[PDB]
């Protein structure tokens, strides 16, 4: 198992390049840092950086920069959480334009 | 629409134009195999469509 930086409802895991495995199935994961809003299992492998509530990146700054990746994605990538993403841009745009 | 039994047509033999008739059923059936009003179109007897 990889080292865990935090434990609980919010989980932060840093991994090397190895086939980390536990009771069940095994998969290979690239080295990096991963964080999830839920206590569910997380990995740097593919099919893991697709699930909602899961953030990943090469480093701490890389993860923070990649957190905004869906924002430049063409429309039609989120289904339910589109409203909050839209509002987070609408508020900034309306303020920065209409006032300043 | 048409109850005709004979149909006219022409052809050229030895540089002259002759004429001959083609027989038809006259109002019964359609024969979708060759979409023409035929009479027993499977026998080479006289009077059959050809």
């Amino acid at each position: 198992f990889p080292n865990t930086y935090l434990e609980g409802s919010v989980r932060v895991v840093t991994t090397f390049d190895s086939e980390y495995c536990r009771h069940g199935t095994c998969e290979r994961s690239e080295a990096g840092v991963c964080v999830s809003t839920s206590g569910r299992w997380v990995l740097n492998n593919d099919y893991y950086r697709s699930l909602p509530g899961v953030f990943c990146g090469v480093d701490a700054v890389n993860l923070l920069t990649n957190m905004f990746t869906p924002l430049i994605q063409p429309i039609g990538a989120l289904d339910i959480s589109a409203s909050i993403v839209a509002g987070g841009i609408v508020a900034i745009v309306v303020t920065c334009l209409a006032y300043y | 629409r048409n109850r005709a039994t004979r149909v006219e047509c022409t052809t050229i033999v030895n540089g002259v134009r002759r004429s001959f008739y083609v027989y038809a059923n006259g109002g019964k059936g359609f024969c979708k195999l060759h979409n023409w009003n035929c009479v027993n179109c499977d026998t080479f007897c006289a009077g059959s469509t050809f």
Binding site: P74, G76, A77 | -
Partner: protein, 50 residues
């Protein structure tokens, strides 16, 4: 007992009896609906218009 399927079959039979030029577009719509219901998912991604 239930006989909805028999009623639908009878409706389809009566529709086929009253053949027109526009029956093909309805058949195409039906077969497309069946095909989309049967597979779906696989080739739908992005393209909200699609």
């Amino acid at each position: 007992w239930d006989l909805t399927a028999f009623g639908l079959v009878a409706e389809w039979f009566l529709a086929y009896i009253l053949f027109t030029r526009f029956f093909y577009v309805l058949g195409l719509a039906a077969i497309m609906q069946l095909f989309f219901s049967y597979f779906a998912v696989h080739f739908i991604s992005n393209s909200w218009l699609m």
